Symmetry: C3
């Protein structure tokens, strides 16, 4: 598939297992 | 809606508020 | 110029040079 827009919520996101997950967590 | 291709410039981006932002800007 | 899904392998991904790169490359 193609990837949809990430949340519109002030936060940056990486992509993991077909979903948007916060970057802050991994960092 | 869907995300577009990110810039092509040798650096890595994440997805935020409907734009591609540098990873270094968070690290 | 929609971008296809990242590999399904449990890893966080950032977009770079028209490809998916592992977040941990830079961590």
């Amino acid at each position: 598939k193609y990837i949809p827009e990430a949340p519109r919520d002030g936060e940056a996101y990486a992509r993991k297992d077909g979903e948007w997950v916060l970057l802050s967590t991994f960092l």
